[PDB]
Symmetry: C2
Subunit: 145 residues, 2 copies
């Protein structure tokens, strides 16, 4: 036995306008914007929303993603769904991406990257192949230190 | 003020709930907390958690599978070309009646006029895709 995952870190939601999604969540749902990052090189803008002003240990957030250009992954995804905004993927928080990644590989799970890369913030991330997720794109994410 | 406690669970629809759960346990080390089977709705549901014990705001994964071809889960699957995947997100609330009122008062469209009964004895309702702007968002209150 061994718990590889701390909790669901966030559920990613793709849409055409990230700042609009945030205002809506805040004003209509009473959720809070905890982080907003714009990745020029990636052509994507991402905002983290939470049902509370302060995160609790295992509080899952909602990550809103939006395109900055037609070449971004989100844009291509939106195109694949003919402009239909929706759930994109799930991210599961891990204590040690390397250790866990090694474990998953043994289990027969295949990862998108051989080595973790920098995600939103100082987080090291990787993804499982869709099939490994049984139809769901599942991201692995570890917070710094 | 805050209308939502936390994301209660993320629903995942698939052909076989049992196979999915075994996979989650064997490969991911996740834990199966409860299993439910509703023969009238023709649906089997299984609640999974990344830990054996749920912490107060710990979100679970709800695995959904059909008992027959006439179930909404089967239709959703056919609608999606047989591809299993994320079905919806559910947000937990302290008082479903109080929150539903606030939501409507703010122009949100709810599927049911009055909270419905779901699995586990939970009162629930949903927001129209336009309300959840793309994703199906469920509202759920625990019975205590």
């Amino acid at each position: 036995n061994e718990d590889l995952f701390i909790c669901i870190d966030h559920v990613a939601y793709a849409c055409p306008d990230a700042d609009e999604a945030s205002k809506y969540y805040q004003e209509t749902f009473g959720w809070h914007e905890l982080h907003r990052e714009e990745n020029p090189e990636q052509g994507v803008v991402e905002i983290m929303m939470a049902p509370a002003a302060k995160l609790t240990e295992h509080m899952t957030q909602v990550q809103v993603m939006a395109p900055l250009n037609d070449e971004s992954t989100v844009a291509k995804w939106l195109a694949k769904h003919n402009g239909r905004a929706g759930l994109h993927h799930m991210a599961w928080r891990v204590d040690d991406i390397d250790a866990v990644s090694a474990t998953l590989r043994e289990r027969g799970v295949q990862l998108l990257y051989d080595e973790p890369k920098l995600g939103t913030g100082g987080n090291r991330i990787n993804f499982m192949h869709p099939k490994s997720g049984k139809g769901v794109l599942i991201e692995l994410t570890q917070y710094p230190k």
